[PDB]
């Protein structure tokens, strides 16, 4: 053959892979967490968006902390040999490093560890994408007028918001981040590399949304998502 280059993940396996969507809307009263209205809008948007990318989508609603862990464990134990990638979307309350099940917190690290290069061998060297719509703390952004690989390699964490900050959700339109993610995936998945798509998502969230509240503490606030990439190649959803 002629000259060959290898800067891009192999995305022409028989299957694109799984897209697990965990949608937590209703929380056990004892937790004191409020219902996440608008999140069903998000889950259906993601389901459609990733369906069109040829992912096998599994929607799961209102999972306990135990069910979340058990699901991820079971999924990480499937044979992913014929799949190009793995995607997991988490829609819930959160704080830094944490996502809530319906009855209490789950460490984000506990979830992603199931898919480490040494623990999920059929995903070794393949891109593992975690998309996280959840708070990462309580800060508000006021804005301004204008032969071995690492076991932690090949992960991408697409956070809805900066470390330490609230994440914003509209009870009618869905979360700012997931709204924007789906729009940019629909428009550019056949054209742009994933990092460049997520940058467009950053710009959309940063420029087109601003909170409206009767409460001055929460009014006129802004949001910037946060891409955390441990990927080792370029990721294109086409081939």
């Amino acid at each position: 053959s002629g000259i060959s280059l290898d800067n891009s993940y192999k995305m022409d396996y028989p299957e694109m892979g799984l897209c697990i969507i965990i949608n937590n809307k209703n929380f056990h009263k004892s937790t004191g967490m409020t219902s996440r209205s608008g999140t069903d809008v998000d889950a259906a948007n993601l389901r459609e968006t990733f369906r069109n990318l040829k992912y096998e989508v599994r929607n799961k609603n209102d999972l306990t902390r135990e069910e979340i862990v058990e699901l991820m464990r079971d999924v990480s134990k499937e044979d992913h040999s014929k799949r190009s990638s793995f995607v997991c979307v988490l829609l819930s309350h959160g704080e830094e490093g944490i996502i809530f099940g319906t009855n209490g917190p789950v460490d984000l690290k506990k979830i992603t560890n199931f898919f480490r290069g040494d623990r999920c061998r059929s995903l070794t060297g393949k891109p593992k994408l975690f998309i996280i719509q959840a708070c990462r703390g309580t800060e508000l952004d006021c804005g301004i007028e204008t032969h071995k690989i690492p076991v932690e390699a090949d992960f991408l964490y697409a956070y809805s918001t900066a470390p330490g900050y609230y994440s914003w959700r509209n009870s009618k339109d869905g979360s700012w981040f997931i709204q924007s993610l789906c729009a940019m995936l629909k428009q550019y998945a056949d054209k742009l590399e994933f990092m460049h798509i997520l940058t467009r998502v950053n710009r959309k969230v940063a420029t087109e949304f601003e909170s409206f509240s009767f409460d001055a503490t929460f009014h006129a606030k802004k949001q910037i998502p946060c891409i955390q990439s441990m990927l080792t190649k370029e990721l294109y959803f086409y081939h």
Partner: peptide, 4 residues
């Protein structure tokens, strides 16, 4: 608009 609501926070999560």
């Amino acid at each position: 608009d609501e926070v999560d």
